PDB file of C-alpha atoms in Angstrom:
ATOM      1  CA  UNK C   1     -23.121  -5.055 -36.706  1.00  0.00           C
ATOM      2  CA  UNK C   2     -24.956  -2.273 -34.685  1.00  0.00           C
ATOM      3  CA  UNK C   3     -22.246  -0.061 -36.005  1.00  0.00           C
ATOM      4  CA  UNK C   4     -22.399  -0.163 -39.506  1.00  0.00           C
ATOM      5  CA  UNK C   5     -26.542  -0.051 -39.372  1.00  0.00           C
ATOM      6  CA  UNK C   6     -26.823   3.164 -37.635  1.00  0.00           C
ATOM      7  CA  UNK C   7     -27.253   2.457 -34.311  1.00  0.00           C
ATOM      8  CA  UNK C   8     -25.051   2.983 -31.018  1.00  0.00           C
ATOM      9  CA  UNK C   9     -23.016  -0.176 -29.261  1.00  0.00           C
ATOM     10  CA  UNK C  10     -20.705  -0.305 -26.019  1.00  0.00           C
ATOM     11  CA  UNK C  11     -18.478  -3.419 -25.582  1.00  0.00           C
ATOM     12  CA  UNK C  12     -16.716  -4.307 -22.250  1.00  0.00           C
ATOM     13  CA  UNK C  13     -13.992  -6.771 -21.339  1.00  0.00           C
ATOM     14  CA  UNK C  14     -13.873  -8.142 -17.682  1.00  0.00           C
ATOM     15  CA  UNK C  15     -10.400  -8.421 -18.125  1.00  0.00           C
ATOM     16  CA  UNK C  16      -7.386  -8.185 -20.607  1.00  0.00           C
ATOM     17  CA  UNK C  17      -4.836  -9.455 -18.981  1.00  0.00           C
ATOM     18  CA  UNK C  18      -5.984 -13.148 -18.669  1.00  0.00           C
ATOM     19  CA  UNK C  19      -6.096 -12.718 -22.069  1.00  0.00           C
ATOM     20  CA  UNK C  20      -2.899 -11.952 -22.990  1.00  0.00           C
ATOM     21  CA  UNK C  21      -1.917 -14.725 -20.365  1.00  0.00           C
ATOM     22  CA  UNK C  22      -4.220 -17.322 -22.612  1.00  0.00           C
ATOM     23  CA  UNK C  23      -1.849 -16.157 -25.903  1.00  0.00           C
ATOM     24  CA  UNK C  24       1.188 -16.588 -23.690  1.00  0.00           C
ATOM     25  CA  UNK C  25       0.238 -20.057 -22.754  1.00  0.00           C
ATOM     26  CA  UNK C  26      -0.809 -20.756 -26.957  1.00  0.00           C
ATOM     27  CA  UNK C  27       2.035 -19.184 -27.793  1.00  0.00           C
ATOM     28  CA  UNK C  28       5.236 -20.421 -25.461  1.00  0.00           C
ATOM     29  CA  UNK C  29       3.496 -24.221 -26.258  1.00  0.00           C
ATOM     30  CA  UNK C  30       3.806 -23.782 -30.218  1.00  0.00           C
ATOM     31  CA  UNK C  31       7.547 -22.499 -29.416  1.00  0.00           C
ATOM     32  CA  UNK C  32       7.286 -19.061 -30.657  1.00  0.00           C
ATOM     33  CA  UNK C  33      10.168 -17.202 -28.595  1.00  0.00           C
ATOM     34  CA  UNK C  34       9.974 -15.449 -25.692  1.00  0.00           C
ATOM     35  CA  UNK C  35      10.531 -11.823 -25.221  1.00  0.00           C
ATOM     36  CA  UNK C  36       9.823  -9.005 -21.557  1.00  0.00           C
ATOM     37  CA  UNK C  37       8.037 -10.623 -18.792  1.00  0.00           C
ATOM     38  CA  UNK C  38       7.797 -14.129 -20.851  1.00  0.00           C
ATOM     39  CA  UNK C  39       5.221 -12.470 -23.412  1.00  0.00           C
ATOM     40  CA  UNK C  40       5.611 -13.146 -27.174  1.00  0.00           C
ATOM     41  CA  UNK C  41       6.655  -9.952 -29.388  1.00  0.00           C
ATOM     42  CA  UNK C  42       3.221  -9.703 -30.850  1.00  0.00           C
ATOM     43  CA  UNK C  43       1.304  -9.202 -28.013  1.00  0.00           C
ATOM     44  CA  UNK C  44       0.814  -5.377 -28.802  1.00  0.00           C
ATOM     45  CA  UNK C  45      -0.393  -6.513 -32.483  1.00  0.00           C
ATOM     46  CA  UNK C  46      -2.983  -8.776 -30.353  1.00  0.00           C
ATOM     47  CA  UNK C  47      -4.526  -5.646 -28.283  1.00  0.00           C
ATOM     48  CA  UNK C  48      -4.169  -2.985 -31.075  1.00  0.00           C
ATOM     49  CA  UNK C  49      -5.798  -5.094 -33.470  1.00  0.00           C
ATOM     50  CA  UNK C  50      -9.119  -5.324 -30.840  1.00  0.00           C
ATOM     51  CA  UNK C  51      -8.858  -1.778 -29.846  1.00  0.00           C
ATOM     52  CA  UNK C  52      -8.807   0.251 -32.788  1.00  0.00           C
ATOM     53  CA  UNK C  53     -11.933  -1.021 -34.203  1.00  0.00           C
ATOM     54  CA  UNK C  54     -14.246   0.962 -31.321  1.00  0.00           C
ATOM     55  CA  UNK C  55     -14.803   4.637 -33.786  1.00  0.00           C
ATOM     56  CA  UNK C  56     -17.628   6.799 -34.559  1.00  0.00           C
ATOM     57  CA  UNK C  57     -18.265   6.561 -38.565  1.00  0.00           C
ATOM     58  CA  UNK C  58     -18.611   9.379 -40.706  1.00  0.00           C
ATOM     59  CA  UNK C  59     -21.886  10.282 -42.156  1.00  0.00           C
ATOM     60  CA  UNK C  60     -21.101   9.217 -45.740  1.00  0.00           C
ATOM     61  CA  UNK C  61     -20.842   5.537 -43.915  1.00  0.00           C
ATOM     62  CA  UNK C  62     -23.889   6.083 -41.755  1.00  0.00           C
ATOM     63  CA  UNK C  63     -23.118   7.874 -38.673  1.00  0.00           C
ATOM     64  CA  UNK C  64     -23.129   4.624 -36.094  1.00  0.00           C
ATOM     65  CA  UNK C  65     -21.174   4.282 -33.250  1.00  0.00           C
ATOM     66  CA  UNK C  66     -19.188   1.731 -30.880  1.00  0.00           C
ATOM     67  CA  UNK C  67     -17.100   2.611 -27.753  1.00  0.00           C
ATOM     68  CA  UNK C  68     -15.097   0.174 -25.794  1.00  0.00           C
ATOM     69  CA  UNK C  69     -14.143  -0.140 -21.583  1.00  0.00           C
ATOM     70  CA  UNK C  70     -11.186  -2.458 -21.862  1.00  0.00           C
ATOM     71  CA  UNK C  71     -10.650  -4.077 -17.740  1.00  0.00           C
ATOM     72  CA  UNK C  72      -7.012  -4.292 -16.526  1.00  0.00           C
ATOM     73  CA  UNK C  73      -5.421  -6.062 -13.130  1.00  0.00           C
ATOM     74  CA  UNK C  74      -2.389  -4.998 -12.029  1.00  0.00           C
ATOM     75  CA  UNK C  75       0.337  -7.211  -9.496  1.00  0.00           C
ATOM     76  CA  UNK C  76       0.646  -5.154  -6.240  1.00  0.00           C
ATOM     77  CA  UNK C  77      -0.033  -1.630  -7.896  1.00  0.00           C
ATOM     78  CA  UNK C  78       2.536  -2.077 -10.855  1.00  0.00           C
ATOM     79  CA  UNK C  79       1.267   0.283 -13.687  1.00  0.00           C
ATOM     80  CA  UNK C  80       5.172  -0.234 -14.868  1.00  0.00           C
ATOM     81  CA  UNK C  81       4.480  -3.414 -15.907  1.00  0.00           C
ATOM     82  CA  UNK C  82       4.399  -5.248 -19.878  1.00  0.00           C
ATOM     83  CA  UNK C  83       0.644  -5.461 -20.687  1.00  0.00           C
ATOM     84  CA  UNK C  84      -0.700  -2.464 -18.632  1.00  0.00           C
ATOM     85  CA  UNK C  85       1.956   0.111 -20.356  1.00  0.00           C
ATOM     86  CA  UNK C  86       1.073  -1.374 -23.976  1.00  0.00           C
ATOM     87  CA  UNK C  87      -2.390  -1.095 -23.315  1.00  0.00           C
ATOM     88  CA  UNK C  88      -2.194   2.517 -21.641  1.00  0.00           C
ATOM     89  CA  UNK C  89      -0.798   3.339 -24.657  1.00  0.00           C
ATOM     90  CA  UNK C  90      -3.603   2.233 -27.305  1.00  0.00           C
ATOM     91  CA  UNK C  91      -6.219   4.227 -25.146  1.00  0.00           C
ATOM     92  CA  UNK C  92      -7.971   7.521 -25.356  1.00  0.00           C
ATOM     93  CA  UNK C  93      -7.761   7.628 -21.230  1.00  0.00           C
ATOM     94  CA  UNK C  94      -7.272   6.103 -18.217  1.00  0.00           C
ATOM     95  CA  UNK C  95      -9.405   5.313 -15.117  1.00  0.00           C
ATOM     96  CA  UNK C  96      -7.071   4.577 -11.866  1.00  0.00           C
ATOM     97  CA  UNK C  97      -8.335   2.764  -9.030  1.00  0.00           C
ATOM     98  CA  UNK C  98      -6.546   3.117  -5.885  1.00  0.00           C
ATOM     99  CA  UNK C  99      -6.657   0.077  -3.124  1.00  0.00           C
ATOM    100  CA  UNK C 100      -5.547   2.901  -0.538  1.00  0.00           C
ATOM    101  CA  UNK C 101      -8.346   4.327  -1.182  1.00  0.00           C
ATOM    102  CA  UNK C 102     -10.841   2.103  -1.298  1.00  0.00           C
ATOM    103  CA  UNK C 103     -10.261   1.296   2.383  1.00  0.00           C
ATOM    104  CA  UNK C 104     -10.206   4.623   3.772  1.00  0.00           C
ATOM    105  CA  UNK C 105     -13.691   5.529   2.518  1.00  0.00           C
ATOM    106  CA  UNK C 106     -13.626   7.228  -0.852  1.00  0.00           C
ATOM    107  CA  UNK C 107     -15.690   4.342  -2.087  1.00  0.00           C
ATOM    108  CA  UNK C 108     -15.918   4.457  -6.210  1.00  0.00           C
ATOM    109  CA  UNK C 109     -11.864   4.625  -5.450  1.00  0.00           C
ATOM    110  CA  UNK C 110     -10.739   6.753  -8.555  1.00  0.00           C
ATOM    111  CA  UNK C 111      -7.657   8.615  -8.496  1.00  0.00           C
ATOM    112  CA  UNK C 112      -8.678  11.747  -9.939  1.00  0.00           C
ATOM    113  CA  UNK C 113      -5.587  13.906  -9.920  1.00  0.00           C
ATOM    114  CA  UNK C 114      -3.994  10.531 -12.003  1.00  0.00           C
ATOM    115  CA  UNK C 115      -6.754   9.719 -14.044  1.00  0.00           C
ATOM    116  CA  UNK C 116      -7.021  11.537 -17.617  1.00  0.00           C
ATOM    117  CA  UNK C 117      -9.390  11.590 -21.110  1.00  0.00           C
ATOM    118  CA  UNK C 118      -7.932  13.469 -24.404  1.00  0.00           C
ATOM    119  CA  UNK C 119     -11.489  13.963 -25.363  1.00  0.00           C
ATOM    120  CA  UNK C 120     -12.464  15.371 -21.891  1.00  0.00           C
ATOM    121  CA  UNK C 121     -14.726  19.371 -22.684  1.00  0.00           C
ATOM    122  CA  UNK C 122     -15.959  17.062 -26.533  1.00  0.00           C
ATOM    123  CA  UNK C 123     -17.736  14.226 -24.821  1.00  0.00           C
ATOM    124  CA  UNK C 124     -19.534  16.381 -22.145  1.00  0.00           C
ATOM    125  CA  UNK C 125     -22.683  18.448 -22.473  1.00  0.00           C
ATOM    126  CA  UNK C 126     -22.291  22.434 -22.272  1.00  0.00           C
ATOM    127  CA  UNK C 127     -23.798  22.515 -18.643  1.00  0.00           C
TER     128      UNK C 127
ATOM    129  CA  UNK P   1       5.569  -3.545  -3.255  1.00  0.00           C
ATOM    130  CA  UNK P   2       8.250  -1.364  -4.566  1.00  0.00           C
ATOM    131  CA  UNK P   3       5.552   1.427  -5.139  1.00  0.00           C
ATOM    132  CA  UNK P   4       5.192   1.560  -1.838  1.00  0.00           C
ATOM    133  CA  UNK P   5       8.409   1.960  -0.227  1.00  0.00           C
ATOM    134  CA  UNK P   6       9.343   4.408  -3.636  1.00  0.00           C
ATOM    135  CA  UNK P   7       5.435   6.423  -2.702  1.00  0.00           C
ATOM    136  CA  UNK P   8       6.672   6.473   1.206  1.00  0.00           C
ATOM    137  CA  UNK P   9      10.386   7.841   0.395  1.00  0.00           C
ATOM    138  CA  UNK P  10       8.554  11.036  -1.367  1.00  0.00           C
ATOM    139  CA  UNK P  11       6.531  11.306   1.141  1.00  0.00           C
ATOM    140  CA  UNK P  12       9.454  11.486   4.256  1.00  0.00           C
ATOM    141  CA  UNK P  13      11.355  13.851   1.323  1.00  0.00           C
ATOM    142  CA  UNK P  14       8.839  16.355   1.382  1.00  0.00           C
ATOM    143  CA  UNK P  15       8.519  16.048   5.157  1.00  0.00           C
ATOM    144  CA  UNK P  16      12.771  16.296   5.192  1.00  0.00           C
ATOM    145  CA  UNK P  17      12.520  19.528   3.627  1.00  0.00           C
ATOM    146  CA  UNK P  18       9.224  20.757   5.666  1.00  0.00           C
ATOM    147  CA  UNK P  19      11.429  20.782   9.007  1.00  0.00           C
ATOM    148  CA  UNK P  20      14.604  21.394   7.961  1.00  0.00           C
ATOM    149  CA  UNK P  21      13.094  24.912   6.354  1.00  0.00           C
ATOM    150  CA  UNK P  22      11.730  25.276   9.802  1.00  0.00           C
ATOM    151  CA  UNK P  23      14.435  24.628  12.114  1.00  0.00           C
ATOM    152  CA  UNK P  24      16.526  27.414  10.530  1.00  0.00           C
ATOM    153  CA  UNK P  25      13.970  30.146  10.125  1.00  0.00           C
ATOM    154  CA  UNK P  26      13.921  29.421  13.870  1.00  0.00           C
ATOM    155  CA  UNK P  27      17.865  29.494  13.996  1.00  0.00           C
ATOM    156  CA  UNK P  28      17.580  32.886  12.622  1.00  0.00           C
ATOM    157  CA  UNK P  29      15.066  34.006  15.027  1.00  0.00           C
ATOM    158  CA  UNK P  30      16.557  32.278  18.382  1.00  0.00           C
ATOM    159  CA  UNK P  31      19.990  34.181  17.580  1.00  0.00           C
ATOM    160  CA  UNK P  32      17.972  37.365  17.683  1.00  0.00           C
ATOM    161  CA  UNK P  33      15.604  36.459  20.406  1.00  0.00           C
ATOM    162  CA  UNK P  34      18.674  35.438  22.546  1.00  0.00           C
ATOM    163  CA  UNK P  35      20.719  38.775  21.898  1.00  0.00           C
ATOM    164  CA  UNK P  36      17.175  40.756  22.161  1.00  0.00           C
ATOM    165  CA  UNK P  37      16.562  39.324  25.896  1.00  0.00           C
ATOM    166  CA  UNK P  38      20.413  39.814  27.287  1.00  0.00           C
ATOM    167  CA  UNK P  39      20.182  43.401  25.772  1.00  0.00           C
ATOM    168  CA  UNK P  40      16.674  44.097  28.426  1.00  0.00           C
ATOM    169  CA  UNK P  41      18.655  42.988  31.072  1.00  0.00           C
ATOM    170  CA  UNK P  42      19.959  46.313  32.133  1.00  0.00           C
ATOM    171  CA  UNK P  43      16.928  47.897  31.926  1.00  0.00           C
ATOM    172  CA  UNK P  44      15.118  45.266  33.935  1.00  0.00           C
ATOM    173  CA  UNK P  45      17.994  45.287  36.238  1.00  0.00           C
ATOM    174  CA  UNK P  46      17.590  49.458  36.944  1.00  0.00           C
ATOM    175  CA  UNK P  47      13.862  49.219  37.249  1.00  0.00           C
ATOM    176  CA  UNK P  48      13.894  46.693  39.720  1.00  0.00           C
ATOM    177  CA  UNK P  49      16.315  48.217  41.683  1.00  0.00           C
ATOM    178  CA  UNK P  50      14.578  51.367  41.629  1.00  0.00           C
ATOM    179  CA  UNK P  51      11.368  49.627  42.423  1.00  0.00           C
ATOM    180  CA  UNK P  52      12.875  47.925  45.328  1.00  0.00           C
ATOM    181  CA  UNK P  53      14.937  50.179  47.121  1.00  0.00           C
ATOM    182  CA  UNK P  54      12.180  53.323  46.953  1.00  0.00           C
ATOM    183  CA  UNK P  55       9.390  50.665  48.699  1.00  0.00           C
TER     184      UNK P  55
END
């Protein structure tokens, strides 16, 4: 709504993954069959779908804005896994968090030499 | 986690290679060092003896 008026909007979700577990449940219960790590086969139509609407409009349609900061959990540091590789793959970059270091005192824990944005040098200022 | 037993097997690789690079840069150097101390031996011998028997 912000969007198409003009204005500016950011929209954040805690967490994708117990999403894709609540379609899992929804969808294993209406029998739909099973594919990798129990999921059904359109769980990358689910996230991609969500995703892709976060743009910046061209002028002609008003110039408005929405960006998105999609939350992910991963089992025992498993970026390997189903939902965090389809969802790594939908994204403009990726912010890793480290649980090493988070206890040895590098406390916002990002792993900067790992961590990446296409748009990095466009989306900062020139100082 | 398998990430950490694959994240600790780079980590002893790299140490692997660290020492083995070492130990024969040192091999090269004690096969020298060896040869370089027998072949002072004579002189050391001559000057002591000198030394010695002239006090």
């Amino acid at each position: 709504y912000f969007r198409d008026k003009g204005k500016h909007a950011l929209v954040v979700y805690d967490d994708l993954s117990k999403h894709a577990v609540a379609y899992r449940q929804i969808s294993l219960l209406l029998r739909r069959p099973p594919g990798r790590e129990a999921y059904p086969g359109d769980v990358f139509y689910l996230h991609s779908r969500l995703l892709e609407r976060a743009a910046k409009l061209s002028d002609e349609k008003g110039g408005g804005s929405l960006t998105a900061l999609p939350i992910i959990e991963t089992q025992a540091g498993d970026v390997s896994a189903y939902i965090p590789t389809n969802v790594i793959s939908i994204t403009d970059g990726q912010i890793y968090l480290e649980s090493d270091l988070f206890y040895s005192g590098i406390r916002p824990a990002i792993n900067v030499g790992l961590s990446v944005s296409r748009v990095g040098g466009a989306a900062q200022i020139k100082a | 986690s398998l990430r950490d037993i694959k994240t600790r097997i780079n980590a002893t690789k790299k140490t692997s290679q660290i020492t083995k690079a070492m130990e024969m840069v040192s091999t090269s150097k004690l096969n020298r060092a060896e040869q370089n101390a027998k072949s002072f031996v004579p002189y050391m011998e001559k000057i002591q003896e000198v030394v010695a028997n002239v006090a």
